[PDB]
Amino acid sequence: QERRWKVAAAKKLVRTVVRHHEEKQLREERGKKEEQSRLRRIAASTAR
Amino acid sequence: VGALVFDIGSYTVRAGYAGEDCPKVDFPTSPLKNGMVEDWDSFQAILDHTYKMHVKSEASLHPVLMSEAPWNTRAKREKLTELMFEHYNIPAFFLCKTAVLTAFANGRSTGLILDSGATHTTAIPVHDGYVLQQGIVKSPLAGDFITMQCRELFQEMNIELRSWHNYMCNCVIQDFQASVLQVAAQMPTVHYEFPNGYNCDFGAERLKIPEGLFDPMLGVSHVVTTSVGMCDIDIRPGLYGSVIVAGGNTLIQSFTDRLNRELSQKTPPSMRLKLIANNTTVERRFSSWIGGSILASLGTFQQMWISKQEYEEGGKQCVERKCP
Amino acid sequence: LEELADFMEQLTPIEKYALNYLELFHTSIEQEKERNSED
Amino acid sequence: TQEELLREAKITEELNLRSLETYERLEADKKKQVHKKRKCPGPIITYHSVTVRCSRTFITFSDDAT
Known part of the structure; x- marks a missing residue:
């Protein structure tokens, strides 16, 4: 049972870490895209 | 306090x-050879000359706006805000x-x-x-190239076309452009006289000189036609129906007419160019x-500028954040 | 007529220029193909 | 002078037709109706419900502050 718990816990923890990394990368990509769109909207507001 | x-x-x-x-x-403007600030000391000196001599006012009172080239790099903008705010202590800034x-x-x-x-x-x-950065097309066939065609032709004429003398030379080749250049195939022509009275019958050269920017490198018509090619697919009709020109270097006779012909025959005939x-x-x-x-x-603009408060709170980063 | 006059006065420089420009060059929002916006 | 004619005649077209009032013109063009110019309402929140068989709502915020 301890081996089972440790395998399952290692699986869950490593997959949560992988999730952390993927969410982090998606957050940086989203931040770059949002900054681009924010500058575009400022340009739109001034042109408007 | 007028801006x-x-x-x-x-x-x-x-x-x-x-x-x-x-x-x-x-x-006349150099610290801007390629298009942005090459020499920060010279650029600062000319700006100081501006506020003090040209407009006879301190920079600490009026709000200030500056304009930078479309293709200028970001470090130029960051250093520009740093220099301006630190040295001249303006109340609010903007860049366009x-x-x-x-x-x-x-x-x-x-447009x-x-x-x-x-x-x-x-x-x-x-x-x-x-500005669509990916769509910009930049070519070396500027007014300098045409004016240097003029200067070479004048030297071939052998006319006598310290720095002030060179400034005069550049001005005359520019002054000649406005009066003479139009875009045996040109028939008799003008008698444009130099300040000392020298002149000639400026014949076919007036036609062949402006031809460089179309055919000496990418000519202007090709520059624009590829520029829109690199832009979005469906906004392209909007650009053609909104083509605009600016700058004193564009001042040639029938220049805009030749551009309109070139684009009309290059653009699909159905288009609203x-x-x-x-x-x-x-x-x-x-x-x-x-x-x-x-x-x-x-x-x-009272909300768009970079107030001095903003630069006190944060450094050069505000230029990328507040100026498109 | 008088209202347009006294309103045309106090028209700061930029807007007098804009008056002349829009007088000569005009515009047209519609291009006869706005239906494409629907589709 | 037919080329010169085409030129200043199209210029005359622009000048004269700009004098008429979107009516009085024999070629009565369709559906002008000059809609509103909106003109400011500062920062705004737009509520937009559209048919897509189905109905969807999009809420637009003018700026990041709001």
Whole structure:
């Protein structure tokens, strides 16, 4: 049972870490895209 | 406290107040060879000359707007804000692209801008006031190239065409352009006289010299046609129906007419291509400064500028954040 | 007529220029193909 | 002079037709109706419900502050 718990816990923890990394990368990509769109909207507001 | 608007253009600097129509001072610009600030000491010195001599006012009182080239790098903008705020202690700042100011001056936010200056002629598509960096096309067939064709032809004429003498040389080759150049195949021509009285029958050269920017490198028509090719697929009809030109270096006779012919025969015949004829020298030279002036005048510029408070709170990062 | 006059006065420089420009060059929002916006 | 004629005749077209009032013109063009120019309402929140068989709502915020 301890081996089972440790395998399952290692699986869950490593997959949560992988999730952390993927969410982090998606957050940086989203931040770059949002900054681009924010500058575009400022340009739109001034042109408007 | 009337807002001050400056253009730091490559070949002549235009300065004035936001609410005033014309740049009250327009003098030759150098620290801007490639298009942005090459020499920070020289650029700072010329700016100081501007506020003190040209406009006879301190920078600590009026709010200030500056305009930078479309293709200028970001470090240039960051250092520009650092220098301006630290040294001149203005109350509020802003930065704008010259092409965007040209499109604003024409009251047409969505546009394509053809402009040229020292060493460069560029085509920029602007959609809803945002310059598409990926779509810009930059060519070396600037007014400098044509004026150097003029200078070479004059030296071949063997006319006697310290720095002030070179400035005079450049001016005369420019002055000759406005009067003579038009875009045996040209028939008899003008008698344009030099200040000392020298002259000649400036014949086919007036036709062959302007031909360089179309056919000496990418000519202007190709520059624009590929510029729109690199832009978005479906906004392209908007650009053609909104093509605009600006800059004193564009002031040649029938130049805009030849552009219209070139684009009409190059564009699909079905397209709504049209050129906005701000062809007068005054119009082209004031176009960018005009856009800056309008931008500064409005009641929203009070919220768009980079207030001194902003730069106190944060450093150079504000330029990328507050200026498109 | 008088109202347009006294309103045309106090028209700061930029707007007098804009008056002349929009007088000569005009515009047209419609291009006869706005239906494409629907589709 | 037919080329010169085409030129200044199209210029005359622009000048004269700009004098008429969107009526009085024999070629009565369709559906002008000059809609509103909006003109400011500062920052705004737009509520937009559209048919897509199905109905969807999009809420647009003008700026990041709001």
